[PDB]
Chain A
Amino acid sequence: DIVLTQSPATLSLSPGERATLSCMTSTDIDDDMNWYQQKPGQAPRLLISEGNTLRPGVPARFSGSGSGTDFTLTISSLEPEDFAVYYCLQSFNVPLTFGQGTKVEIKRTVAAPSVFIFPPSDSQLKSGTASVVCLLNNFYPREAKVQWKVDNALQSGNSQESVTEQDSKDSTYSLSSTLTLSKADYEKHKVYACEVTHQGLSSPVTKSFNRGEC
């Protein structure tokens, strides 16, 4: 199968700047390279077709170049609507194969997260489970580490993280980390803490609570 390798994984740039995305193939594909744009919750849209031709109707700032195994998509000057995921596709032979995608992301200034921790509700406990939620709100850039400690013991394997898309207004991320325990396990311990490390903080930040108090 023909392998398509995109670079970089994420490209963080400001509107008005040039963006150059790369797609390398594992073997020659007779220049049958195609590029797609996709935004969250939408179908991909064709930008460039075989022979490096810009699809009619697509803005002129998009262009494709390259040959052999080395292909490029260039956006001469990024507009707000250009921040998206871009995929390459070879249509030279079957199986048809896509690159793994490049996310073009909105560069903004660093913003530390505001951290909040929420104990499980009484109503959830009544149903027999305990989810402890740690919220990291409105931060940039995307990279953040969250660690759970229960009576000062580091947890592993019992938490799940989820992240929003960049906010439409301020271009920040928010992230939830949820620690899930049975009610019985939740009741075996008193102190619950989430520790957050992020570039915008001068030191890690811990938010915590004790099951024995309000």
Chain B
Amino acid sequence: EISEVQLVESGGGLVQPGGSLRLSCVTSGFTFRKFGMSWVRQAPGKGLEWVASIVTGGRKTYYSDSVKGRFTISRDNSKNTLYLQMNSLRAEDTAVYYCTRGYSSTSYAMDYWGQGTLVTVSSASTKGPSVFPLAPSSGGTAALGCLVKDYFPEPVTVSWNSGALTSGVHTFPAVLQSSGLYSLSSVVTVPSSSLGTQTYICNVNHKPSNTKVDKKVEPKSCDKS
């Protein structure tokens, strides 16, 4: 429906420290020039943090002390578009960046939010994960999984048996390692009696590297039970 307020972000992605990125947000479902707009960000696992706001007409702007002098907010009212030019980027600027609309003529309180776009600032080069088995070996149920190690940037997706296996699956949030690469595991619990009979395959997809890895997880060869 054409009444739907939408704020669609773009221009995010990968950058090295010291580098630059320009975010864009294209709006619809309302008269763009009639509303103040803001950028708000959220570092992984952290809370909401306001970044910058701009008035209806675009000649007046406000910044958090964290980004002042590095970031510039602007708008083009003829294109329904809001911008965030981000210069001299640092690792601490890694976050999902949300475009938001101020709810009233005097307030930047956000009423509509975009889906957000991830910006990752790092020296690391894009790299697909290495995938290692967590072999099984408990009330007739066993645990197994895959270690999804050393990839960059976020995110990866993990499924089991091409998505046919979902019950008892837990896939952990990634942790950023001191190498600058990410790691996580995914585990699943299954009947022990199925081990060596049912095949278990973790399907690991990493869009940034265009990699897909299917790792079969089986009991160790030295396991005879």
A210 near B: Cβ within 8 Å?
no
Interface size on A, residues (CB 8 A): 46
Assembly CA distance A161 to B98 (angstroms)? 28
B187/A174 in contact, CB under 8 A: yes
B94 near A: Cβ within 8 Å?
no
**Which residues of the other chain, B, contact A100 by a CB distance below 8 angstroms?**
47
Interface size on B, residues (CB 8 A): 46
Q: How many cross-chain pairs have Cβ atoms below 8 Å apart between A and B?
A: 126
A137/B220 in contact, CB under 8 A: no
B187/A137 in contact, CB under 8 A: yes
B223 near A: Cβ within 8 Å?
yes
B70 near A: Cβ within 8 Å?
no
User: Which one of A96, A118, A135, A174 contacts B108 once the chains associate, using CB atoms below 8 Å?
Assistant: A96
**Which residues of the other chain, B, contact A160 by a CB distance below 8 angstroms?**
175, 177, 183
B193 near A: Cβ within 8 Å?
no
Q: Is the interface of B mostly helix, strand, loop or mixed?
A: strand
B173 near A: Cβ within 8 Å?
yes
Q: Is the interface of A mostly helix, strand, loop or mixed?
A: strand
Contact with B along A93-104 (1 / 0, CB 8 A): 011111111000
Assembly CA distance A137 to B170 (angstroms)? 9
Which residue of chain B lies nearest to A33 when distances are taken between CB atoms in the complex? B109
B185/A123 in contact, CB under 8 A: no
A133/B47 in contact, CB under 8 A: no
B132/A124 in contact, CB under 8 A: yes
A135/B109 in contact, CB under 8 A: no
Assembly CA distance A91 to B103 (angstroms)? 11
**Which residues of the other chain, B, contact A98 by a CB distance below 8 angstroms?**
47-50
Q: Which of B145-204 contact A (CB under 8 A)?
A: 145, 147, 149, 170-175, 177, 183-185, 187, 189
B contact residues vs A (CB 8 Å cutoff):
38, 47-50, 53, 62, 64-65, 98, 103-104, 107-111, 113-116, 130, 132-135, 138, 143, 145, 147, 149, 170-175, 177, 183-185, 187, 189, 220, 222-223
A contact residues vs B (CB 8 Å cutoff):
32, 34, 36, 38, 43-46, 49-50, 55, 87, 89, 91, 94-101, 114, 116, 118, 120-121, 123-124, 127, 129, 131, 133, 135, 137, 160, 162-164, 167, 174-176, 178, 180, 214
